Amino acid sequence: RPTFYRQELNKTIWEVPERYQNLSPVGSYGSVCAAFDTKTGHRVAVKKLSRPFQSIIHAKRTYRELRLLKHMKHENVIGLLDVFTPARSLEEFNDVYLVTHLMGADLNNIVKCQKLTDDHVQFLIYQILRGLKYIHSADIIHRDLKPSNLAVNEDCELKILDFGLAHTDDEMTGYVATRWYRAPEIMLNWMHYNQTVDIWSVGCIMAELLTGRTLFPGTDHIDQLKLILRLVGTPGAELLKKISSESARNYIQSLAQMPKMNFANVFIGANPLAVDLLEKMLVLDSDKRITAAQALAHAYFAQYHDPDDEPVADPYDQSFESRDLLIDEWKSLTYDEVISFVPPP
Numbered sequence: 607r608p609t610f611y612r613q614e615l616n617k618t619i620w621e622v623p624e625r626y627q628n629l630s631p632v633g634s635y636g637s638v639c640a641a642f643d644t645k646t647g648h649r650v651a652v653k654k655l656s657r658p659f660q661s662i663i664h665a666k667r668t669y670r671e672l673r674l675l676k677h678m679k680h681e682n683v684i685g686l687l688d689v690f691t692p693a694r695s696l697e698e699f700n701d702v703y704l705v706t707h708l709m710g711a712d713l714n715n716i717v718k719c720q721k722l723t724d725d726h727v728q729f730l731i732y733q734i735l736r737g738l739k740y741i742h743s744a745d746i747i748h749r750d751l752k753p754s755n756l757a758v759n760e761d762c763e764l765k766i767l768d769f770g771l772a773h774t775d776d777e778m779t780g781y782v783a784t785r786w787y788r789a790p791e792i793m794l795n796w797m798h799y800n801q802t803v804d805i806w807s808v809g810c811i812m813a814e815l816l817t818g819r820t821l822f823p824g825t826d827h828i829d830q831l832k833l834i835l836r837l838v839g840t841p842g843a844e845l846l847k848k849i850s851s852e853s854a855r856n857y858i859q860s861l862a863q864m865p866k867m868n869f870a871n872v873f874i875g876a877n878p879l880a881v882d883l884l885e886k887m888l889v890l891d892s893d894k895r896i897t898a899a900q901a902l903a904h905a906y907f908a909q910y911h912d913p914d915d916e917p918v919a920d921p922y923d924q925s926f927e928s929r930d931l932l933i934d935e936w937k938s939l940t941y942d943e944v945i946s947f948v949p950p951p
């Protein structure tokens with residue numbers, strides 16, 4: 607066990623191992639400090655979880671987040687550098703700290719402040735799909751892909767972060783970026799969703815890098831649905847059968863029918879191979895969207911695709927999600943995962 611030291615920063619007590627130095631508050635879910643990790647030489651983000659065990663729902667969310675971060679080992683996905691508690695026993699266990707690489711710019715800063723060549727768009731979208739092939743191979747769904755959740759450095763290298771741990775109703779209301787990248791079947795709860803919702807988000811992101819503009823900036827759920835159906839067309843009877851709510855099906859049939867638009871006249875001047883890929887991502891029926899593994903072999907990525915360097919993930923057991931436990935049982939499972947952590951090479 608390392609030696610810990612205590613300090614009060616911005617009305618918060620931080621008790622951390624000696625290896626972490628020069629702590630400086632950055633953000634505030636949890637509270638975050640930047641620090642220098644003397645063991646590895648990296649600048650890191652240290653997150654102290656807020657009330658991780660106050661309720662059954664919060665205790666299970668803490669466990670879910672720690673299990674997810676411990677599993678992710680891929681160049682294009684955020685991973686876990688360390689996790690610790692100052693507790694010496696389960697009986698005194700109360701606080702959890704997570705340590706990751708400190709991130710700087712996100713894709714928003716690049717998308718709004720940079721002139722992207724088509725070569726930049728190829729490389730950035732390739733890396734998102736390479737990380738998604740890995741995530742999806744473990745039967746994990748990200749659920750919240752958007753420019754603010756994508757870290758990018760000066761060399762145009764990209765990491766996916768901030769997995770959806772199950773956002774609220776006020777958060778998705780009105781003219782807000784938290785909803786502009788969501789697939790229509792999850793935005794309006796049309797059906798049980800799956801990993802195909804992430805490919806819809808990649809299409810919205812790719813379109814925005816090509817044009818510099820948000821693809822579907824709706825002022826509310828219904829305005830956003832109208833923008834989507836104007837581009838991709840209103841649904842046929844085949845997809846209508848797959849929507850469970852009769853009211854939702856009735857609402858769809860209240861709208862005048864519209865054909866899918868010509869994407870070369872929407873994305874004027876774009877690489878014809880980029881136009882072709884967008885048509886294969888932005889498909890209303892989620893059964894028919896291209897998958898991440900299939901998209902990596904598309905000719906748009908010919909310069910970067912390497913089928914011997916696009917790895918899949920170890921199996922991930924999520925049976926805990928259907929389990930009913932008490933607060934102290936979720937807390938004990940979390941404690942076991944903290945003490946069993948083994949750092950990366």
Ligand SMILES: CCCC(=O)Nc1nnn(CC)n1
Nearest residue numbers: 678679680681685686687950
């Ligand atoms: C913080 C540690 C995250 C991690 O393990 N990243 C990583 N990148 N590629 N691999 C295996 C090839 N593993």
Ligand SMILES: [Cl-]
Nearest residue numbers: 608623624625
């Ligand atoms: Cl230490």
Ligand SMILES: [Cl-]
Nearest residue numbers: 683684685707
């Ligand atoms: Cl990482």
Ligand SMILES: [Cl-]
Nearest residue numbers: 693699700701
């Ligand atoms: Cl503690």
Ligand SMILES: [Cl-]
Nearest residue numbers: 752753754783
């Ligand atoms: Cl965003």
Ligand SMILES: [Cl-]
Nearest residue numbers: 861862863864
């Ligand atoms: Cl009509």
Ligand SMILES: [Cl-]
Nearest residue numbers: 921922923924
């Ligand atoms: Cl597992």
Ligand SMILES: [Mg+2]
Nearest residue numbers: 754755767768
């Ligand atoms: Mg985020």
